[PDB]
Amino acid sequence: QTSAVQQKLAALEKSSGGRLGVALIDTADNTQVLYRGDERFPMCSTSKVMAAAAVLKQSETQKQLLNQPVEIKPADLVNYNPIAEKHVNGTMTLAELSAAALQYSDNTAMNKLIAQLGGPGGVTAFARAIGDETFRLDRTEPTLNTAIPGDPRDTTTPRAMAQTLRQLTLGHALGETQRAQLVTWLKGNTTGAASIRAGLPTSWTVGDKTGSGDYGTTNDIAVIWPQGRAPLVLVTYFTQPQQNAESRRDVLASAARIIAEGL
Ligand SMILES: O=C(Nc1cccc(-c2nn[nH]n2)c1)c1cc(C(F)(F)F)cc2[nH]cnc12
Ligand SMILES: O=C(Nc1cccc(-c2nn[nH]n2)c1)c1cc(C(F)(F)F)cc2[nH]cnc12
């Protein structure tokens, strides 16, 4: 079937010229709303959530992991390093790297998380350990954002990412302390106000992680605490045919508004 919500998402997509993927989980009833829910999309920096969560999982058996000093070197800097470049020739802890990756979208910080996990495949391995058979991380920053149509590398589906984000932030994929830390980090994101949150009533609280890449790829994944409702998890992924396409955070906001209006 095609629901009213799905037809409105399709109309948004058609007007936009790109390809839109949406997955909602409403935790008040566990119901799902999907649009291209089983199609693959480039994750871009939304993958930083899985990397940070994988490090949080490692920290469950190492109380000091998040506090040990990690050296930052000049050659570590990549293409977007607002936090890490201030610590070149110094150190950052894995907590600081997690916070920088999640809240500032720092790509050098993400590479340190990936390295702690043994490379991109260590991030994939954690996904599999928490029941996500779909996620794959294949490259480091910045090349994981090439976002080439048809390329499976560094992709997931909306359905899989919503399920995983629910398990990480609201469920029991992480220990209690670690889940709370992840939620605190997401709620303190600096980059999200133009994306999913722009489509929702202002009174609802959002924690989210954005991403963007080539092909005008524009993404957001969010855990939402609505006014007067159980929490929601929402994934909105968007990608365009032209490599040089401009980002379209407004499309994500529009998708979120349709979802909210459909509840
Ligand atoms: O920093 C960003 N993008 C970036 C960084 C490094 C390099 C390149 C790039 N490399 N080749 N073309 N562009 C692009 C960024 C973009 C976006 C937007 F609007 F969605 F596109 C939102 C953000 N919020 C925080 N940072 C961002
Ligand atoms: O790294 C990149 N973008 C980036 C960096 C940091 C943060 C964010 C971001 N965080 N939240 N939204 N956007 C996005 C990027 C990389 C590349 C390439 F070639 F693969 F290396 C091409 C790009 N075209 C547009 N952006 C890119």
Automatic annotation (TrEMBL):
InterPro entries: Beta-lactam/transpept-like, Beta-lactam_cat, Beta-lactam_class-A, Beta-lactam_class-A_AS, Cefotaximase. Gene3D superfamilies: DD-peptidase/beta-lactamase superfamily. It holds the Pfam family Beta-lactamase2. Its EC number is 3.5.2.6. Keywords: Antibiotic resistance, Hydrolase, Pyrrolidone carboxylic acid, Signal. GO terms for molecular function: beta-lactamase activity. Transmembrane segments: none annotated. One of its GO terms (biological process) is beta-lactam antibiotic catabolic process. It catalyses: a beta-lactam + H2O = a substituted beta-amino acid. Residues 21-236 form the Beta-lactamase class A catalytic domain. PANTHER family: BETA-LACTAMASE, BETA-LACTAMASE-TYPE TRANSPEPTIDASE FOLD CONTAINING PROTEIN. Belongs to the class-A beta-lactamase family. This is Beta-lactamase. It comes from Escherichia coli. The gene is CTX-M-14.
